What we know:
This is Protein A6 homolog. By secondary structure, the chain is mostly helical. It has 16 helices and two strands. Bound molecules: the ligand CCCCCC/C=C/CCCCCCCCCC(=O)O[C@H](COC(=O)CCCCCCCCCCCCCCC)COP(=O)(O)OC[C@@H](O)CO and ligand 6OU (4 copies).
Amino acid sequence: MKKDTNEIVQDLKKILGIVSLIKSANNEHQAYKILMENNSFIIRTINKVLADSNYIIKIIALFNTDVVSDKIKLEEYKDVFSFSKENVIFGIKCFCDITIDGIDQINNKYVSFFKKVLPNIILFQTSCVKTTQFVNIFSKLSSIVYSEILTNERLHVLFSEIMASFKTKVSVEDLKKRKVNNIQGLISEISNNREMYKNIFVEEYEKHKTTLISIVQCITDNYNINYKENAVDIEFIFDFIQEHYISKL
Ligand SMILES: CCCCCC/C=C/CCCCCCCCCC(=O)O[C@H](COC(=O)CCCCCCCCCCCCCCC)COP(=O)(O)OC[C@@H](O)CO
Ligand SMILES: CCCCCCCC/C=C/CCCCCCCC(=O)O[C@H](COC(=O)CCCCCCCCCCCCCCC)COP(=O)(O)OCCN
Ligand SMILES: CCCCCCCC/C=C/CCCCCCCC(=O)O[C@H](COC(=O)CCCCCCCCCCCCCCC)COP(=O)(O)OCCN
Ligand SMILES: CCCCCCCC/C=C/CCCCCCCC(=O)O[C@H](COC(=O)CCCCCCCCCCCCCCC)COP(=O)(O)OCCN
Ligand SMILES: CCCCCCCC/C=C\CCCCCCCC(=O)O[C@H](COC(=O)CCCCCCCCCCCCCCC)COP(=O)(O)OCCN
């Protein structure tokens, strides 16, 4: 699967390329043109990701070259991280039970873009969830995520402190001089320095957990985001992903 992990780096380059075209675009109508000119790529990729029950394990394999050299590891990874067509269906159904009464509906050209692709996402049609609802939740959520990452001040503070602490453990100047600036260089740096970057991640996460949970919980509260007409428990979600997913890497 050296070509399939090649597939993922090739897809991420084209994705980041779409992104840099949208960021540096003069207005919405230009970004909407940019998304439509990539219309078949975005729909093919979603469909291709969702039908590849091993896609997550192929992402792990970019970062652990030592996994491809051991089918026991790979298969103990497929036990945790492989998802089926019905897992995808189940996850879409669960997605539409999120309510965000905290902000009006979004209708810009991204939302109109979003509704043009969904009748071609095969497994989304299979779910028989109403497009109006799914679009509404997805557009409200991604509007919140992007707005909070750009505008939330506690998040900016926290990002700054993790950034500074990072710089005291890794020489970013010497990384830039060894040309670890691109996506491939960055992938290779992490995969060859696995144990360290993962310990850096764990330690920064543990040091800053209370802030991070608090910030995200205050976001879900301040937009009244519910799951099954109930408050969302960020702490429980984060501890959950930790015990069943992150810890098994
Ligand atoms: C811009 C693109 C970025 C997107 C990419 C997404 C990447 C996600 C994860 C990538 C890397 C994750 C961490 C890698 C570390 C792997 C090892 C590991 O994390 O497993 C172990 C679990 O512990 C631990 O802290 C685990 C640390 C806990 C982390 C909890 C994560 C919670 C995040 C929740 C986000 C969910 C989103 C939904 C929002 C509601 C830690 O390592 P070990 O040496 O076994 O032991 C040391 C400790 O266990 C104590 O003994
Ligand atoms: C560069 C990034 C490196 C990331 C490293 C991985 C970190 C992972 C942390 C994120 C959260 C973990 C997600 C685990 C999802 C897999 C679990 C799953 O199978 O879903 C099952 C339930 O399904 C659901 O509810 C939702 C499933 C949807 C997952 C599929 C989503 C596709 C993922 C593709 C990611 C995007 C790729 C883009 C990159 C170019 C679990 O049920 P089970 O009882 O455990 O089934 C047992 C039978 N196997
Ligand atoms: C693996 C399973 C997961 C796949 C799920 C498929 C979803 C992929 C579909 C992507 C199509 C885009 C969907 C529209 C999202 C609507 C977000 C939204 O509400 O718009 C705004 C959110 O902000 C933005 O998104 C601004 C635009 C920046 C980039 C937007 C789109 C990124 C393009 C990604 C291209 C890659 C697609 C390929 C995926 C495989 C609302 O914010 P605002 O403050 O009102 O103003 C923004 C001013 N720039
Ligand atoms: C970087 C981009 C961030 C995107 C964040 C929003 C994406 C939404 C989907 C993300 C995956 C959600 C992970 C679900 C896995 C948790 C599985 C689980 O434990 O089951 C359930 C966990 O509860 C849920 O499923 C919540 C449903 C997902 C909604 C989470 C979205 C919250 C919004 C956060 C946005 C904050 C933005 C922060 C910006 C950095 C327990 O539910 P229960 O059975 O009714 O019992 C209640 C027990 N307390
Ligand atoms: C960037 C490169 C890729 C990085 C990989 C990260 C991608 C993962 C993020 C999205 C995938 C969702 C992550 C959580 C995985 C689900 C956790 C899980 O184990 O499954 C179940 C999930 O828990 C839930 O009840 C639902 C939680 C909310 C799921 C909604 C958000 C994810 C689904 C979105 C589907 C995306 C595909 C749609 C594409 C258009 C456990 O449910 P259960 O009630 O306990 O009963 C079933 C078995 N007990």
